[PDB]
Enzyme design. Structure first.
Site, PDB file in Angstrom:
ATOM      1  N   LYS A  26       0.854  -1.236   0.000  1.00 34.18           N
ATOM      2  CA  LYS A  26       0.000   0.000   0.000  1.00 34.18           C
ATOM      3  C   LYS A  26       0.864   1.251   0.000  1.00 34.18           C
ATOM      4  O   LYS A  26       0.416   2.316  -0.347  1.00 34.18           O
ATOM      5  CB  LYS A  26      -0.914   0.059   1.235  1.00 34.18           C
TER       6      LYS A  26
ATOM      7  N   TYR B  50       1.903   3.865   7.372  1.00 34.36           N
ATOM      8  CA  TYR B  50       3.248   3.258   7.138  1.00 34.36           C
ATOM      9  C   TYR B  50       4.342   4.337   7.229  1.00 34.36           C
ATOM     10  O   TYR B  50       5.448   4.030   7.626  1.00 34.36           O
ATOM     11  CB  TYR B  50       3.361   2.559   5.767  1.00 34.36           C
TER      12      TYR B  50
END
Ligand code: NDP
Ligand code: NDP
Lengths: 359, 359
Positions: free
Chosen positions: A120, A147
């Protein structure tokens, strides 16, 4: 007396549960390994029969994390393979900070932190993507992807404490945990198991493109091997690294295999027919699942736990997400799996462990 | 005194010319290797500076083949890496039969025959394809593909003479030979070199799909390594085997790299613009090429020899042709290349050898 001591944050997860197996193999790099496994739920039955010291701990609660992890003075490598169940940058970030803040001051032989994120990173969030094949050097997208927060904390904390780090970006994971929030294989096995129960065909609900396009995945054990590699091989240190099986497949071929494995008829993609939501098709099947569980004497799981029908929906409107393994290979990691075989192997293992019906 | 003696049929070709280099490396499995190289043209200058015994021989002429190859009593491994320039099943078949009929009775220590075909085995002929990723076990299509004839002769002749065999099905080859009938990289380097000469941009002539789809290729040296592996490792014997670089790429990214390598502006694919024939764009450029050759003091080549613009046309209306390397990998062959890097490396090597202009 052990050579290495692993803290596996997320030990009930789709990767953490593999690490719990792989770290205890005799040939495993850096072994013999002692294993602490952290998760929030009480130790489920299947995991109590594994040689992992289970620490029940809500890692989003800082005082609790301090009291539970600060005594763990022997830790040498942390494997952060967890996330809260959502995309909140703040709440995901809290978990990871609390792990580091509780362990770094207390484990004087700490060497390495492995952080698991995902692909992602390259195309955005589930709530304008890079083109693929995705390579590790691609810059961050301008999105609130948690992230980014986890990496920043990882780099900050390892650098000031003279620790090495790795970031692992697996592809879609093929694994066996019935406790995961995103387990595609168990999700599809559950759907199949329900079709079979209700004498229906294995009807594909997804898009044309996801049926026909190339896709890739990673076996959970391979992710564990990849993470263990980066944790012990100096050549791999302080690198961002993709992790996939090394090949490509199509859902169209997997669907055929799935039907065969359950001995039911398949209805593939139908030209012009549009995606339907598997989440909606399975909206009130929980008692059916409960019945199948008792009937087959399965490990007791709730429908929402073993399956993530929402996630299959996303996989089935996705395309063009292939990631490259060249970096890892040029660093000397040559682990791979046949994705068709890895899928079947996940099916077998979930039958083996009694999460889903045999035959 | 040598350990192994190779007959390389097609030594001037895109793979044969790699084998001529790779077989003479000190670390090469089965070495030290003596190398006989066969081709029809007289030995070109560049090949006369290699330690290969060159046999000029039209292998479609049986008496000539007998007189030229029957004295070669020391041969241990044949590498058939040739085809006539067309898809005629009969004339391709003649070449291969004449090699075997001339060598098998005369080389008492013959062990193995490697036959190189290709991924066309899976989707048809250039003159109803399997879906991909292509795997070795896929049955033959009902087409007159000369690859079928070559296999049948291979199986017949090796079986009755107690010889082992391998069939290699490479993907699109990235290589350096200016004598090949199908060299994509030299073809595209020539186009680029001409654009630059005429102060034009590197304009992409192909289809939307070939710009955007995943594609794969194989470096010539890797094909040589793969063939050498199958020739010496008992685990690989009597197998049909795909051969590609182990990754995927897009022409869109390669096109950017190509422009950069020649320091010219790129015009990528343009939405709605339809494929144009590169063969037609380059229809009467032969004197331009001749000029560029003399001007840069290149190895003298004719335009039709270094380039195969017809073939780039085919690559640029192709899609969905990915082949799997799982079989080879599960047999223990873990050779690979980064395809973006292999492409650049072919460019460098063709500059190095003076087939195309430096810088
Ligand atoms: N296919 C996939 O699943 C993929 C996942 N990833 C990424 O990998 C990373 C890790 O995810 P994945 O392996 O899927 O995780 P899973 O959902 O399989 O596992 C989550 C683990 O974290 C634990 N956990 C969750 N919240 C808490 C908490 N507050 N305290 C302690 N433990 C907690 C869970 O235990 P408990 O149940 O008790 O809370 C569980 O053990 C994520 O960033 C994800 O995006 C990347 C690519 C593919
Ligand atoms: N990208 C590619 O090029 C790919 C090729 N393949 C396959 O690999 C196989 C081998 O082809 P490839 O390596 O491309 O070959 P090339 O065209 O690069 O080389 C052909 C070689 O065969 C020799 N040859 C041709 N006719 C004769 C003859 N009558 N007598 C003696 N030698 C002859 C040529 O020498 P001379 O010039 O003197 O005749 C040359 O050395 C083919 O089946 C092809 O389809 C498969 C996938 C990809």
């Amino acid at each position: 007396s052990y050579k290495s001591v692993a803290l596996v944050v997320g030990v009930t997860g789709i990767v953490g549960s593999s690490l719990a197996e792989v770290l205890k193999l005799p040939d495993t790099p850096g072994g013999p390994w002692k294993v602490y496994g952290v998760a929030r739920r009480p130790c489920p039955v299947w995991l109590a029969k594994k040689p992992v010291e289970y620490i029940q701990c809500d890692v989003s609660d800082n005082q609790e994390t301090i009291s539970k992890l600060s005594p763990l003075k022997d830790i040498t490598h942390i494997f952060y393979v967890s996330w809260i169940g959502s995309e909140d940058c703040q709440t995901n970030a809290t978990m990871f900070k609390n792990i580091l803040n509780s362990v770094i001051p207390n484990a004087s032989n700490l060497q390495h932190v492995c952080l698991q994120t995902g692909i992602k990173h390259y195309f955005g969030i589930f709530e304008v993507p890079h083109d693929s094949p995705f390579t590790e050097d691609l810059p961050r997208l301008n999105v609130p992807n948690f992230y980014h927060d986890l990496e920043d904390i990882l780099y900050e904390e390892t650098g000031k404490n003279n620790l090495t780090w790795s970031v692992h970006r697996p592809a879609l994971v093929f694994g066996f945990s019935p406790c995961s929030m995103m387990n595609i294989v168990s999700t599809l096995c559950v759907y199949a198991t329900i079709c079979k129960h209700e004498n229906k065909a294995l009807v594909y609900p997804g898009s044309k493109n996801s049926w026909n396009c190339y896709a890739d995945a990673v076996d959970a054990d391979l992710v564990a091997e990849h993470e263990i590699w980066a944790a012990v091989d100096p050549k791999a240190k302080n690198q961002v690294l993709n992790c996939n099986n090394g090949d490509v497949f199509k859902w169209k071929h997997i669907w055929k295999k799935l039907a065969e494995e359950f001995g039911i008829e398949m209805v593939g993609y139908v030209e012009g027919k549009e995606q339907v939501s598997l989440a909606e098709l399975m909206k009130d099947k929980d008692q059916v699942w409960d019945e199948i569980v008792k009937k087959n004497n399965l490990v007791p799981t709730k429908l929402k736990e073993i399956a993530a029908f929402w996630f299959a929906d996303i996989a089935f409107c996705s395309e063009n997400l292939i990631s490259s393994m060249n970096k890892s290979k040029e660093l000397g990691f040559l682990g791979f799996r046949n994705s068709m075989k890895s899928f079947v192997s996940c099916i077998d293992k979930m039958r083996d462990y009694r999460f889903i019906p045999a035959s």
